[PDB]
Design an enzyme around this catalytic site. Structure first.
Site, PDB file in Angstrom:
ATOM      1  N   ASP A  65      57.845  23.126  80.100  1.00 11.55           N
ATOM      2  CA  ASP A  65      56.768  23.475  79.066  1.00 11.55           C
ATOM      3  C   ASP A  65      55.260  22.944  79.351  1.00 11.55           C
ATOM      4  OD1 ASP A  65      58.514  20.826  78.420  1.00 11.55           O
ATOM      5  OD2 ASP A  65      56.815  20.286  77.258  1.00 11.55           O
ATOM      6  N   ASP A  74      60.834  18.860  74.482  1.00  6.52           N
ATOM      7  CA  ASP A  74      60.319  17.770  73.757  1.00  6.52           C
ATOM      8  C   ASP A  74      60.013  18.215  72.501  1.00  6.52           C
ATOM      9  OD1 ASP A  74      58.573  16.152  72.264  1.00  6.52           O
ATOM     10  OD2 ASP A  74      57.468  14.970  74.102  1.00  6.52           O
TER      11      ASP A  74
END
Ligand SMILES: CCCCC/C=C/C/C=C/C/C=C/C/C=C/CCCC(=O)O[C@@H](COC(=O)CCCCCCCCCCCCCCCCC)COP(=O)(O)O[C@@H]1[C@H](O)[C@H](O)[C@@H](OP(=O)(O)O)[C@H](OP(=O)(O)O)[C@H]1O
Ligand SMILES: Nc1ncnc2c1ncn2[C@@H]1O[C@H](COP(=O)(O)OP(=O)(O)NP(=O)(O)O)[C@@H](O)[C@H]1O
Ligand SMILES: *[C@@H]1O[C@H](CO)[C@@H](O)[C@H](O)[C@H]1NC(C)=O
Ligand SMILES: *[C@@H]1O[C@H](CO)[C@@H](O)[C@H](O)[C@H]1NC(C)=O
Ligand SMILES: *[C@@H]1O[C@H](CO)[C@@H](O)[C@H](O)[C@H]1NC(C)=O
Ligand SMILES: *[C@@H]1O[C@H](CO)[C@@H](O)[C@H](O)[C@H]1NC(C)=O
Ligand SMILES: *[C@@H]1O[C@H](CO)[C@@H](O)[C@H](O)[C@H]1NC(C)=O
Ligand SMILES: *[C@@H]1O[C@H](CO)[C@@H](O)[C@H](O)[C@H]1NC(C)=O
Ligand SMILES: [Mg+2]
Lengths: 214, 942
Positions: free
Chosen positions: B354, B675
């Site tokens: 990400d 996350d």
């Protein structure tokens, strides 16, 4: 003087037949107390009885048994009567050192302990190109000590040139003879140096390869 | 344990009425606990210790480890050791009918081995325990003590503590709700119902341990901790490499078994035939014990072949490596929660990451502005701006943004100012401060009461607005938007001299091409700030926000950049070099995502790679009807590099699609670095999942195999390296042990065929077994890694354990050792002039011939232990030998113990003292081992 009639001498061969030694107290005016068989002056176990006549039976006669047997008679107030029966056999070496390894300039010892009767005359020989010639005490560095059943040869200040060889003890007597041999090896004082040079060569070639290829 | 334990059981609204009956309200509960109110806690050490002992309990079950004596008892019960012990007992008993000095020795030697092995276990487990302790230290929770907000370990929480709850937190203990905002909690871990329960004081103020905080924030007071908690009640009252190694173990074991049986039977047969048939001898039972002694000796040597032939502890070696690597991995910022995921990281062939946090530092700053119809690549002077528009701009930015986001002063040691809250909001605040004004006075003129209509920021709208009643008989609306949603809505531009100019589609289409598109192309997120006026209408209908958020006036447009970390370009280059493709998943628009991806080097400019968005991805993967089909996914994923404007479930879709596709020739192993609160399932679908430690939700850390403590992409590369090292270490260990048991066994057998004994006795063979199994594993399995491991493609799941070079080394070194040992055993009497110990009679004294053979065998094994450290045909053996102290310690200790064994302690070990010359010759052969290794390293395997 008491009269004792003893059996004839026996020569111990390889035959397994038991051998009987006999003593007979034919004439004795004294009161006998006891009697005993002995060999080479050593009392034999369980041989003390009344035994006006003595018998000793050996079921498995061997060379180690042959010796000077005695049948001793002890009375009240008369001297012991011993007599003599002698048993012979061929000589045989029991123990000997297989090899002797010593550094140069040291003391070397060899021995050949044997058994038998008559006690064997001991002579030492050294190998000389295939024939066991006699040992020459020219340099005065050989010392031979002879005993009844033991011999000892000692060399002092070993020299690396002449001493290395094979030594034999011949051990003859009136029945036969018996010989064994020992190998003597003398080591130089410069022995550790050569493998050290080999190790150095290995290390330098290893370092050269590793450094060059990298 | 007190009435607080029985207080739990809300199940609706029972607890609130129970409190109203018994205690009154929550204040009575607070004063009963002798606990300070919402303001804070006393925090006095004796009081907290006392209430930890009596009022609550340490929030840690003990897990009950095991002891050393149990380990030695388990090690002792090996079957082959029992066989050896009973054989030694029989020999010792029969020797009386100094021969006993043999049998007794064996027993003592066994008691040594079963000790050392046991000790080894008691060491390695200890290491694992240490790691676990550190994990328990990294779990921290936010509490209020002495009026200060501090972070303490979860094990330190006691009854009465004031714990502050934020979204993404894992509730550590059972408590009571005091105050907060829109606190929604998922209670699926205790009830099985996956809906978000809204917690309020007047409806349901219970908070349960083990639940996930899904939304909102607040405070709570702790009532039940540890085994007394609800989730503690349920707890009470109740690998490719290893599997591939086991087969090799069993195959070698059965081969050794049949070889030992053959040796024993051939010895017995030859002895009987020679003693009876040829040299005709009567049975003569009177002398029958001697015969059976001759058999028992034979039996013993057979056993001593078996214990060397069967590999015991071969599949265990992997764990040893981990036990001596995991701790060091913690210094490269990799906290390993599940150990199985370590070696799996070696075979990783894809990484999905990400954008924010991992690759970009998340330090938002403003570097470009367009205010005043003039593009400003640098921050303008405060005077150079248009007249009277700066006050409006700073007012809009200050009032619009949430007031909780306060940029803390830069009191850190020579460091940049710390940012707290939403990154975009605080970046705009810093930009306002950069123009030499202060939003603090403007915010001080307006408390929360004066504002009456604020639209909370949410990802669906991508914009946030507020309404202010300050203007007399009017209202003012301030709005911040994604610069794409709100540019369509605005109808005028405040530009020029401050007068509004009518905004049209005609100039909008060209202005988007002039500034907005290049702004995005420079990797800058674009945010638009605008406002609107509402006259004193009888009732403005704020409910229909679709029409209220329209006809605005664009104040300004601003670009915000989060710089890419300096290490991640090189890290991505190294990952791609090692055959691991990298993909990016982000929620930005496609232009900024593409620009940042080009900056990081994920996608080269002139390459054919798809950069399609999330909506197009979902539409493509469900062309037929409305379901996901693997065949359709099979076309997008192979060339999907950048995925922008995604959704939380898109990552899971991509991960499963890549992981279960059969299109590729090789099975794919993915490693997602997600996350988030909603990013749980994806982390479980991938082979190994990484979480972020510095700024990461507890929900994300719970489901992750590895935690990165620097929140950096580069550390991921480290993991890969370490994983590969594990495989290599096993290989080199397997290169050594095998060689020994290829030589020893053969030697014994050959002796058994020609002479009537083996040159290596029983206790000597136990010494060799100790060298080859425990010390070898400790020396070789624990090797530090190197970066060169990242220069080879990942290994397939199906590939042989023994490679070509390993087998070449095994055969060559076995050939050299066998030749030297046979030459010695047959011609040593003449090479050294030491007589011959061959055909020694029973109960004979030790000889120098066999002692020389044993000593040179052990020396060759030690120098081959040095040679074994290089697998891939590397010539320089001594590379980095001082990086591992265990290797040097073990090798030199074994050398010293060998020197002690040969010289002193001769009769029990069947050794005789050696002169200096023979020692130098043995070491000369030992070094010839390394020379022959360099010789064989030049043979081409192909
Ligand atoms: C040498 O390597 O070890 C010795 C150890 O012997 C003893 O220890 C027995 C007693 C001594 C015998 C002396 C002859 C011989 O071992 P083996 O020949 O008993 O076992 C082989 C071997 O282990 C290969 O290395 C593997 O090769 P791979 O793993 O690459 O496939 C192969 O595996 P597979 O059957 O799948 O082909 C195994 O079977
Ligand atoms: N305070 C704010 N007011 C208005 N719009 C905002 C605000 N904060 C963010 N935005 C915008 O609204 C959207 C929210 O995106 P956000 O969730 O912050 O990150 P993202 O764009 O999804 N990228 P990522 O962080 O990698 O997931 C983006 O278009 C932002 O630019
Ligand atoms: C010798 O003594 C034995 C034992 O008493 C006896 O039988 C034998 O006749 C004796 N021989 C002579 C010649 O006296
Ligand atoms: C054996 O006994 C007889 C008969 O009494 C006796 O004359 C003789 O001396 C004894 N011999 C001994 C005791 O040695
Ligand atoms: C017996 O006496 C004679 C006396 O000449 C002696 O030679 C002999 O050694 C004696 N026997 C023993 C066994 O002492
Ligand atoms: C030799 O004879 C002596 C006589 O005292 C004896 O002690 C010794 O044991 C005999 N044997 C050897 C091998 O010397
Ligand atoms: C050899 O001669 C030396 C001369 O000193 C003498 O001492 C030694 O006893 C002799 N040895 C023999 C066996 O003649
Ligand atoms: C001892 O000497 C004799 C006589 O010369 C010799 O023939 C023989 O070889 C020697 N003895 C043995 C048993 O060899
Ligand atoms: Mg988002």
């Amino acid at each position: 003087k008491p009269r004792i009639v003893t059996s004839e001498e026996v020569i111990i061969r390889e035959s397994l037949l038991p051998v009987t030694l006999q003593c007979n107290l034919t004439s004795s005016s004294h009161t006998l107390m006891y009697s005993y068989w002995t060999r080479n002056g050593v009392e034999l176990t369980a041989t003390r009885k009344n035994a006006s006549n003595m018998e000793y039976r050996i079921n498995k006669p061997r060379a180690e048994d042959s010796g000077e047997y005695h049948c001793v008679y002890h009375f009240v107030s008369a001297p012991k009567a011993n007599a003599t029966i002698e048993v012979k056999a061929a000589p045989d070496i029991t123990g000997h050192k297989r090899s002797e390894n010593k550094n140069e300039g040291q003391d070397a010892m060899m021995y050949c302990k044997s058994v038998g009767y008559p006690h064997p005359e001991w002579i030492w020989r050294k190998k000389e190109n295939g024939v066991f010639e006699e040992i020459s005490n020219s340099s005065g560095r050989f010392f031979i000590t002879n005993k009844e059943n033991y011999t000892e040869l000692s060399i002092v200040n070993l020299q690396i040139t002449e001493d290395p060889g094979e030594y034999e003890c011949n051990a003859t007597n009136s029945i036969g003879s018996a010989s064994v041999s020992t190998v003597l090896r003398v080591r130089s004082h410069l022995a550790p140096l050569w493998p050290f040079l080999g190790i150095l060569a290995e290390i330098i070639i290893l370092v050269v390869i590793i450094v060059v290829y990298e | 344990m007190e009435e607080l334990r029985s207080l739990m059981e809300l199940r609706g609204t029972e607890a609130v009425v129970k409190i109203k009956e018994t205690y009154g309200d929550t204040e009575a509960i607070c004063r009963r606990l002798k606990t300070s109110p919402v303001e804070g806690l006393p925090g006095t050490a004796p009081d907290l210790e006392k209430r930890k002992q009596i009022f609550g309990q340490n929030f840690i079950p003990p897990k009950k480890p095991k002891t050393f004596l149990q380990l030695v008892w388990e090690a002792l019960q090996d079957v082959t050791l029992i066989i050896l012990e009973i054989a030694a007992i029989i020999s010792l008993g029969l020797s009386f009918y100094a021969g006993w000095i043999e049998g007794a020795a064996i027993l003592l030697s066994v008691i040594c081995v079963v000790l050392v092995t046991a000790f080894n276990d008691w060491s390695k487990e200890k290491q694992f325990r240490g790691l676990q302790s550190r994990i328990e230290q990294e779990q921290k929770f936010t509490v209020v003590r002495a009026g200060q907000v501090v972070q303490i370990p979860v094990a330190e929480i006691v009854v009465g503590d004031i714990a502050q709850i934020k979204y993404g937190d894992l509730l550590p203990a059972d408590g009571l709700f005091i105050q907060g905002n829109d606190l929604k909690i998922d209670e699926s871990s205790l009830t099985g119902e996956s809906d978000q329960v809204r917690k309020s004081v007047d409806k349901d103020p219970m908070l349960l341990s083990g639940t996930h905080v899904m939304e909102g924030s607040g405070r709570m007071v702790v009532t039940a901790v540890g085994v007394n908690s609800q989730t503690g009640i349920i707890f009470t009252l109740l690998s490719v490499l290893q599997g591939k190694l086991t087969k090799l173990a069993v195959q070698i074991g059965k081969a050794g078994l049949v070889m030992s049986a053959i040796t024993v039977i051939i010895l017995v047969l030859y002895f009987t035939v020679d003693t009876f048939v040829v040299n005709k001898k009567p049975w003569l039972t009177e002398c029958t014990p001697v015969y059976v002694q001759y058999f028992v000796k034979f039996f013993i040597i057979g056993v001593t072949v078996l214990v060397v032939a069967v590999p015991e502890g071969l599949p265990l070696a992997v764990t040893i490596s981990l036990a001596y690597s995991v701790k060091k991995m913690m210094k490269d910022n990799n906290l390993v929660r599940h150990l199985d995921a370590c070696e799996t990281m070696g075979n990783a062939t894809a990484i999905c990451s990400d954008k924010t946090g991992t690759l970009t530092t998340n330090r938002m700053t403003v570097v470009q502005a367009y205010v005043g119809d003039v593009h400003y690549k640098e921050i303008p002077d405060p005077s150079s701006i248009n007249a009277k528009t700066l006050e409006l701009l700073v007012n809009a930015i200050a009032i619009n943004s949430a007031y909780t986001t306060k940029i803390l002063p830069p009191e850190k040691e020579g460091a940049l100012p710390r940012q707290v809250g939403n990154k975009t909001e605080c970046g705009l605040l810093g930009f306002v401060l950069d123009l030499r004004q202060d939003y603090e006075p403007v915010r001080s003129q307006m408390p929360e009461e004066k504002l009456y209509k604020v639209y909370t920021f949410n990802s669906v709208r991508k914009s946030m607005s507020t309404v202010i009643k300050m203007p007399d008989e009017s209202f003012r609306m301030y709005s911040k938007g994604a610069s794409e949603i709100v540019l369509k809505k605005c109808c005028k531009i405040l530009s020029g001299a401050g007068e509004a100019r009518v905004f049209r589609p005609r100039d909008r289409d060209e202005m988007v091409k002039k500034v907005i598109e290049p702004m995005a192309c420079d990797g800058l997120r674009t945010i638009c700030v605008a406002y609107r006026d509402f006259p004193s209408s009888p009732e403005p209908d704020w409910d229909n926000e679709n029409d209220i958020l329209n006809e605005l006036t664009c104040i300004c447009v601003v670009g915000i950049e989060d710089p890419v970390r300096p290490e991640v370009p090189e890290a991505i280059r190294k990952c791609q070099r090692a055959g691991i493709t990298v993909r990016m998943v982000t929620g930005d628009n496609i232009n900024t995502a593409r620009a940042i991806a080009i900056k990081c080097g994920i996608i080269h400019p002139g390459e054919d790679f798809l950069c399609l968005e999330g909506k197009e991805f979902n539409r493509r993967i469900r062309n037929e009807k409305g379901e996901i089909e693997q065949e359709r996914i099979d076309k997008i994923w192979p060339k999907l590099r950048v995925l922008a404007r995604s959704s939380p479930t898109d990552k899971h879709t991509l991960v499963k699609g890549i992981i279960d596709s059969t299109h590729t020739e090789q099975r794919q192993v993915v490693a997602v670095t997600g996350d988030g609160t909603n990013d749980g399932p994806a982390l479980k679908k991938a082979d190994v999942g990484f979480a972020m430690g510095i700024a990461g939700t507890d929900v994300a850390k719970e489901a992750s195999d590895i935690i990165l403590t620097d929140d950096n992409f580069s550390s991921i590369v480290k993991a890969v390296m370490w994983g590969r090292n594990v495989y290599d270490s096993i290989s080199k260990f397997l290169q050594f042990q095998l060689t020994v048991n290829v030589v020893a066994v053969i030697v014994a057998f050959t002796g058994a065929c020609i002479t009537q004994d083996s040159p290596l006795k029983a206790v000597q063979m136990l010494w060799v077994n100790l060298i080859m199994d425990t010390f070898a594993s400790l020396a070789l399995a624990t090797e530090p890694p190197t970066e060169t491991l990242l220069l080879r493609k990942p290994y397939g799941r199906n590939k042989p354990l023994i490679s070509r070079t390993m087998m070449k080394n095994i055969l060559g070194h076995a050939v050299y050792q066998l030749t030297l040992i046979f030459t010695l055993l047959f011609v040593g009497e003449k090479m050294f002039q030491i007589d011959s110990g061959r055909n020694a009679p029973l109960h004979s004294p030790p000889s120098e011939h066999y002692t020389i053979i044993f000593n040179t065998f052990v020396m060759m094994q030690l120098f081959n232990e040095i040679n074994a450290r290089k697998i891939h045909g590397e010539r320089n053996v001594f590379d980095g030998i001082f990086r591992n102290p265990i290797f040097c310690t073990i090798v030199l200790g074994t050398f010293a113990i060998q020197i002690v064994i040969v010289q002193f302690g001769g009769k029990p070990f069947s050794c005789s003292p050696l002169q200096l010359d023979q020692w130098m010759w043995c070491i000369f052969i030992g070094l010839g081992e390394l020379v022959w290794g360099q010789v064989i390293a030049t043979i081409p395997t192909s």
